[PDB]
Each structure stands twice: as structure tokens, then as C-alpha cells.
């Protein structure tokens, strides 16, 4: 059971690691879209 607990935690960690990478990539895109939209308003 101690082994199952460690396995289940690695499995959860691996999924949250992937989701962090997806989140950070979206973060970069949304920030570029904002810079583009703010830049449109200054002209």
C-alpha cells in the first residue's frame, strides 16, 4: 500500500506537470495578444 501511495502521487504529479506546461504556453500567448491589443490603441 505504501508503494501504491507513491505510484498514485507520481501519476498525479506527471499530469499536473503537463498541465503547468500547457498553462504557461497559454500565458505566453495571452500576454502577446494583450501587447498587440494595447499597441493597436496607441496609434
Amino acid at each position: 500500500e505504501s508503494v501504491a501511495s507513491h505510484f498514485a502521487l507520481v501519476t498525479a504529479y506527471e499530469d499536473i506537470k503537463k498541465r503547468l506546461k500547457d498553462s504557461e504556453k497559454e500565458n505566453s500567448l495571452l500576454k502577446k495578444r494583450i501587447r498587440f491589443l494595447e499597441e493597436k490603441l496607441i496609434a
Binding site: 500500500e1 505504501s2 501504491a4 501511495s5 505510484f7 498514485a8 502521487l9 501519476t11 498525479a12 499530469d15 499536473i16 498541465r19
Partner: protein
């Protein structure tokens, strides 16, 4: 190995806090279910089968044939589910002998 004889299907990344939750899962040919098996909703990082947030007994499949693949569904009620508490949870299938035989990807209630 033994930890993936039950497969939780189409688990979402998050569920609405305290909303009714259907939990779908599959018994592979490697497990013979038992009426005292159960599915718990565990905070990620749990140490024992005792650390569950809520649970439901797993209904013994009718007309069960050994070595078959069987689909199961459990309706967790919102009033026994986490609120938006910042934690991540997962489903775990626990046999009547105490073994964890499947554990889902994690989800947050928000």
C-alpha cells in the same frame, strides 16, 4: 502494474464545486470485483486508504463473468464532494482486501 487493473474513463481536469459527479470506470480482465470493493475520492498525496474525502461502494456487476471487461458508473452526490478548496483530488479503486487497483488523473473542484 497491479495498480492499473481498474481504469477511470474520461476524467475531467476539474468539476464544479459540490455538483453531482458521475464517475465512470472499467474493470479489466485482471481484477475479479467483490461487493466490498469501493471507490474513494482522495486528496492527492494520500498515504492510506483511510485518507479519502468521500467514498461509495462499488456495485458488484450482475451476471459477472471472470476475465471479462466491465464498465461501471458511480454517482457521487454534490453534498459529499469538496468545495472550491484549492486542493486536487483523484479517484482510487480499493478492493475488499485493501489493495489500490486503480487511480485516476487528478482534478480540482472549481
Amino acid at each position: 502494474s497491479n495498480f492499473a487493473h481498474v481504469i477511470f474513463q474520461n476524467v475531467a481536469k476539474s468539476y464544479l464545486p459540490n455538483a453531482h459527479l458521475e464517475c465512470h470506470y472499467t474493470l479489466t480482465p485482471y481484477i475479479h470485483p467483490h461487493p466490498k470493493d469501493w471507490v474513494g475520492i482522495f486528496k492527492v498525496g494520500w498515504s492510506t486508504a483511510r485518507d479519502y474525502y468521500t467514498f461509495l461502494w462499488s456495485p458488484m456487476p450482475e451476471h459477472y463473468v471472470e476475465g471479462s471487461t466491465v464498465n461501471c458508473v458511480l454517482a457521487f452526490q454534490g453534498y459529499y464532494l469538496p468545495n472550491d478548496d484549492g486542493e486536487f483530488y483523484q479517484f482510487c479503486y480499493v478492493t475488499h482486501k485493501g489493495e489500490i487497483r486503480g487511480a485516476s488523473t487528478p482534478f480540482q473542484f472549481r
